[PDB]
Design a protein around this ligand. Structure first.
Ligand SMILES: N=C(N)c1ccc(Oc2cc(C(=O)N[C@H]3CC[C@H](N)CC3)cc(Oc3ccc(C(=N)N)cc3)n2)cc1
Length: 241
């Protein structure tokens, strides 16, 4: 996260860190039930030197605050049993950039580990609404990851504006969130994490999944996120949640 601040400890109890064996933190995810996380499909693609698509190569840390203190009280370590990438995910366009991760053993809810609420398929996160992005990704483009979880406030951008800022790249599954002036944005390593939106009674709903961007925090280049309402039924069908 660029232009963000240190989260308070336990402020985002749905935020999860995904470590690939021998590589440390790679992506974020969100806790949605005792057994399931939401993340980005692009995190789980094999490359010539590592099988990121193999669930056995991962470890999820729930209740984490500082990457250097992964054994702190309240942090829960879990392995993955399965990774369900959306069938329509396109690794070139990043359309349908969403995945479901099944924990090998259920998360134990606590003050530090709690699921985020999922929005109904008909819910619209309106243009202009303030929402939060969180993660341990880079704090500057080409920079370095954050040890302490970061948070940043960004706003939903009008879809027509989004499409015009990133020509031939924005599909209806995507949403731009940030500022045309730049300054605050997600970045490498924040992928897969949730956008958190404060709703009518203060409860937090997931608005989207960190997906991609052209650089980070640059003017006229807000981050691109996978929308969540569109996938409510897909999540229910594949997880029971
Ligand atoms: N500014 C933002 N809001 C932002 C958010 C998330 C980010 O993380 C990313 C993004 C992308 C990415 O797709 N970036 C652009 C897509 C459009 C292309 N024409 C140019 C590149 C690739 C990419 O590379 C990876 C990294 C890791 C994996 C993996 N774990 N398998 C895969 C791709 N990471 C970057 C920026």
């Amino acid at each position: 996260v660029v232009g963000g601040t240190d989260a308070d400890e336990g402020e985002w109890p749905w935020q999860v860190s995904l470590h690939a064996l021998g590589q440390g933190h790679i992506c974020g995810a969100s806790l949605i039930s005792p057994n399931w996380l939401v993340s980005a499909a692009h995190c789980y693609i094999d490359d010539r030197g590592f099988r990121y698509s193999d669930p056995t190569q991962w470890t999820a840390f729930l209740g984490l605050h500082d990457q250097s203190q992964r054994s702190a009280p309240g942090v829960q370590e879990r392995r993955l049993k399965r990774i369900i990438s959306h069938p329509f995910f396109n690794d070139f366009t990043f359309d349908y950039d969403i995945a479901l991760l099944e924990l090998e053993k259920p998360a134990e809810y606590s003050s530090m580990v709690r699921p985020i609420c999922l929005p109904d398929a008909s819910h619209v996160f309106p243009a202009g609404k303030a929402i939060w992005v969180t993660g341990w990704g880079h704090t500057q483009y080409g920079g370095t990851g954050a040890l302490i979880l970061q948070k940043g406030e960004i706003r939903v951008i009008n879809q027509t504006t989004c499409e015009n800022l990133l020509p031939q790249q924005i599909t209806p599954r995507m949403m731009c969130v940030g500022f045309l002036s730049g300054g605050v944005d997600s970045c490498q390593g924040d992928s897969g994490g949730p956008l958190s939106s404060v709703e009518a009674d203060g409860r937090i709903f997931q608005a989207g999944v960190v997906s991609w961007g052209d650089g980070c925090a640059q003017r006229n280049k807000p981050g691109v996120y996978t929308r969540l309402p569109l996938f409510r039924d897909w999540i229910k069908e594949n997880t029971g949640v």
